[PDB]
């Protein structure tokens, strides 16, 4: 129930792997963020140097955060579209970490991937809509913002607009056409809430990859798991701990290291390497290598 039992034989990658191949581990939820797509050429926000916050000087905006806030987008969409042009990859190639999740799906272990990313790489790796909660939406589709229109446009249309440097307008009514992303200030999709209500009732492992767990309400997903569900973080830095200050005012933060630690494991490094290591323990390494090479070769030949 709400008891804090220890189901990992040890708080290591090796322990997680053994658990994953026990009968108790049938339903895995992945929570992922921008860290899983940095090796695919898309910057995160927070990384020193290569993160976007460091690299937004030219846009002459108040504080680097505004270009992804809904009120600033409403005032002027042009900076956002300009940056989208700058960031739009020539080629969409999912990472090892993406294909690791594809392996979970093919093995019948994936209950859901909840992603904060908007880059569509989960879809390209072969996660289906069913499998996915795009908690912050997606560039995959776009919609005219006009309540009485709401015409849908595909990414090839939006891409053309973004590269032509033409602010996207609706062909039916000439209102702005906006990528289906959730800007800061916006409500998350209803899907997010209903999947969360059901999925966290019966999850056996939470795998958390490439996110700082600072964006809410996404971050609070870690507290929705049962207290005995193991949680593995694969990330360059620890994340999701309780802050010693905020934590003094009235969910289960990550606890990898304290005296009371019983189910949380942190593997610090590149997501691609951590997933590769985990795959190796599970005996999936060659499968993973073959999938990535074949999928990448297939993309390379488009």
């Amino acid at each position: 129930g709400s008891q804090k039992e220890r189901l990992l034989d040890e708080l290591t990658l090796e322990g997680v792997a053994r658990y994953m191949q026990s009968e108790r581990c049938r339903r895995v939820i992945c929570l992922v963020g921008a860290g899983i797509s940095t090796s695919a050429g898309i910057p995160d926000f927070r990384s020193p140097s290569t993160g976007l916050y460091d690299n937004l000087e030219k846009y002459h905006l108040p504080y680097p955060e505004a270009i992804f806030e809904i009120s600033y987008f409403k005032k002027h969409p042009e900076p956002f579209f300009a940056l989208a042009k700058e960031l739009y990859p020539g080629q969409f190639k999912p990472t090892i970490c993406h294909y690791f999740m594809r392996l979970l799906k093919d093995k019948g272990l994936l209950l859901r991937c909840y992603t904060q990313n908007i880059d569509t790489l989960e879809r390209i790796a072969g996660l289906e809509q069913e499998d996915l909660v795009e908690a912050h939406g997606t560039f995959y589709t776009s919609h005219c913002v006009s309540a009485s229109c709401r015409h849908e446009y595909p990414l090839s249309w939006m891409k053309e607009k973004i590269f032509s440097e033409v602010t996207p307008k609706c062909e039916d009514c000439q209102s702005l056409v906006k990528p289906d992303i959730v800007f800061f200030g916006e409500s998350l999709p209803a899907r997010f809430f209903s999947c969360m209500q059901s999925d966290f009732l019966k999850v056996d492992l939470l795998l958390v990859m490439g996110t700082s767990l600072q964006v809410q309400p996404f971050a609070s997903l870690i507290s929705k798991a049962p207290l005995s569900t193991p949680r593995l973080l694969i990330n360059k830095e620890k994340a999701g701990q309780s802050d010693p200050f905020l934590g003094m005012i009235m969910g289960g933060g990550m606890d990898f290291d304290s005296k009371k630690a019983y189910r949380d494991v942190a593997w610090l490094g590149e997501c691609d390497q951590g997933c590769l290591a985990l795959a190796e323990l599970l005996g999936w390494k060659k499968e993973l290598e073959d999938l990535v090479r074949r999928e990448h070769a297939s993309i390379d030949a488009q």
């Binding site: 912050h136 800061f184 916006e186 600072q214 964006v215 809410q216 996404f218």
Partner: peptide, 6 residues
Amino acid sequence: PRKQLA
């Protein structure tokens, strides 16, 4: 609730 930093 709304997308937001903490």
